[PDB]
């Protein structure tokens, strides 16, 4: 009973968090095996920020300029390299707390947990969705750069995001663990357009199924729709078009509840057209799109 | 930038989670030092559930009937005692991962993080508020009993909640770590009334301050109110009466934003009376009461 915006347990990720300082800037690094991953903007200074020449800035840096501290102990840096927008600092000690891990590039609409950190120390954990426009609506302050996003399949941690930047609009931008930015963003202090965002339709439908599973069913109606009719409504309301692939991923929830995917789409159509009429669904007065169908199945079945 | 329902990092609590089996029932236990804490209903069977005689049920149990497993290794139980609604199983090994900890009994309206577990394994973490009526609106399934709620001050974990039960209404009830239920609840399979719940006024005000700090200010008006006028509105809308103690706790947020507490109360008064008019505050279409003024200060300043 109950449905919460649940994050993965952050323990395996806390054991990887380190502090990285270069010059006067301190941020977070991720220590996996004998490598420390961090945003390359750690090598910048305030004059360099509007358009840094990272190649030139890194050339003036030697292994001993990168101060990496894992809690109270200092790590010895024996190599440094820039891969896209990340720095990889080779250290002489493999992290004893390295969990089984993978680097993955998530798709827009997928969810993940963020372990927000400052000075290499964890402050909190929350569940995020990578927006269709490749931004995240996180909670990050100066010093949070290098905080990571991840998913956990039993004992394996799939790292998918590293935080780099806060856009002038207050939304966040970052990279995969190979330093490739999600979206069109560049690591510069420049105004950058995030694309038009949309609501993650498949996730809203998954959350409507979660609502039915947990007793909230007032929104179920006597109607049905087609993918084409629904997609006309989705276009008008800035929702992602629903495809047969999305319908297929909703199969387990459709089977559990006995509510056909197109019947659920018709409920969503009526909610989009008429609103909630002052009512709530799973304690929310808006349509929630931060739960994937996989998240709903996992939470609704207690996968550990 | 940004404001999220952030939970504490669960690492220190994951290292304490164990599985406890007695007879055919398996649930979660909390291993701190050489003691394993778990709900006493682990000793029950389906016939006993409508009104268990815990004293009699425990008498038929010996140390060897309590199977405690910490991951893959089995713990040796050398003592057992019932303290209120919890069982304390003395084990021969002190938990090497025991963090600095305290047992605390939280007040209604206070928040905490829950590490949901099944079979001694963590599945997820979320931030909760203890409702004014002493229930929690969690996400728990069969097997989650023994999952705990906590807060973290730097390196010290204050355990405040242990999950015991799901009421017929889908809301949750549990105890402090001395086995005292929060609320009038008893550990029996009986329909139990939770009191009339109210909205945590001080927390909504704290969240309105967080909204202003993060750029959402459309709700700020040209009005002010008094504690008495505001409390008349709070009574009508099932909000907790605001006291000078609540106003005092809002002092830091009032000082940061320069918005007097009574001016913020007037904004809340207008939102209660007129609604949101289809608008949102920090991505919510309802008034959020799960952030204390302490949570807002912590998140808004990046305390680790
Ligand atoms: C201030 C803040 C808040 C939240 N997250 C991140 C930040 N930090 C930044 O965005 C500054 C970085 C971006 C850069 C040009 C390469 C320097
Ligand atoms: C089924 C479930 C779901 C979520 N949380 C908890 C549960 N479990 C229970 O409430 C069963 C317990 C309560 C008892 C009388 C003493 C047996």
UniProtKB/Swiss-Prot annotation, chains A, B:
Ranges facing Cytoplasmic side: 1-304
For this chain, the site of the Glycyl lysine isopeptide (Lys-Gly) (interchain with G-Cter in ubiquitin) cross-link is: 5, 90
Q: Where in the cell is it found?
A: Host cytoplasm; Host Golgi apparatus; Host nucleus
Q: What is the effect of changing residue 49 to A?
A: Does not affect ability to cleave and inactivate human TRMT1
- Where do the catalytic residues lie? 41 (for 3cl-pro activity), 145 (nucleophile)
State the reactions this protein catalyses: TSAVLQ-|-SGFRK-NH2 and SGVTFQ-|-GKFKK the two peptides corresponding to the two self-cleavage sites of the SARS 3C-like proteinase are the two most reactive peptide substrates. The enzyme exhibits a strong preference for substrates containing Gln at P1 position and Leu at P2 position
Ranges for domain Peptidase C30 come to 1-304
Describe its partners and assembly state.
3CL-PRO exists as monomer and homodimer. Only the homodimer shows catalytic activity. Interacts with host FBXO22; this interaction promotes the proteasomal degradation of nsp5.
What this chain does, per the entry, is described as: Cleaves the C-terminus of replicase polyprotein at 11 sites. Recognizes substrates containing the core sequence [ILMVF]-Q-|-[SGACN]. Cleaves and inactivates human TRMT1, preventing tRNA guanine(26)-dimethylation of tRNAs. May cleave human NLRP1 in lung epithelial cells, thereby activating the NLRP1 inflammasome pathway. May cleave human GSDMD, triggering alternative GSDME-mediated epithelial cell death upon activation of the NLRP1 inflammasome, which may enhance the release interleukins 1B, 6, 16 and 18. Also able to bind an ADP-ribose-1''-phosphate (ADRP).
Q: What is the protein's name according to its record? A: 3C-like proteinase nsp5
What is the originating organism of this protein? Severe acute respiratory syndrome coronavirus 2 (2019-nCoV)
Parent-protein residues present: 3264 to 3567 of 7096
């Amino acid at each position: 009973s109950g449905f919460r915006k649940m994050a993965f347990p952050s323990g395996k990720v806390e054991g990887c968090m380190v502090q990285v300082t270069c010059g006067t800037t301190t941020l977070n690094g991720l220590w996996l095996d004998d490598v420390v991953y961090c945003p390359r903007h750690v090598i910048c200074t305030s004059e360099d920020m509007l358009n840094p020449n990272y190649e030139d800035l890194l050339i003036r840096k030697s292994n001993h300029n990168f101060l990496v501290q894992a809690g109270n102990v200092q790590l010895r840096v024996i190599g440094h390299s820039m891969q896209n927008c990340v720095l990889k600092l080779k250290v002489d000690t493999a992290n004893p707390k390295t969990p089984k891990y993978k680097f993955v590039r998530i798709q827009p609409g997928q969810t993940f947990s963020v372990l927000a950190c400052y000075n290499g120390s964890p402050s909190g954990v929350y569940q995020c969705a990578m927006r269709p426009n490749f931004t995240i609506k996180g909670s990050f302050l100066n010093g949070s750069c290098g905080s990571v996003g991840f998913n956990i399949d039993y004992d394996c941690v799939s790292f998918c995001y590293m935080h780099h930047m806060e856009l002038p609009t207050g939304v966040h931008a970052g990279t995969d663990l190979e330093g490739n930015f999600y979206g069109p963003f560049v690591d510069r202090q420049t105004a950058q357009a995030a694309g038009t965002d949309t609501t993650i339709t498949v996730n809203v439908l998954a959350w409507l199924y979660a609502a039915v599973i947990n007793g909230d069913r007032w929104f179920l109606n006597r109607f049905t729709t087609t993918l084409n009719d629904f997609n006309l409504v989705a276009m008008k309301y800035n929702y992602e078009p629903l495809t047969q692939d999305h319908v297929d991923i909703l199969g387990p929830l459709s089977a559990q509840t006995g509510i056909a995917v197109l019947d659920m789409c018709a409920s969503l159509k009526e909610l989009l057209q008429n609103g909630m009429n002052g009512r709530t669904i799973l304690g929310s007065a808006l349509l929630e799109d931060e739960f994937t169908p996989f998240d709903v199945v996992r939470q609704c079945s207690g996968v550990t």
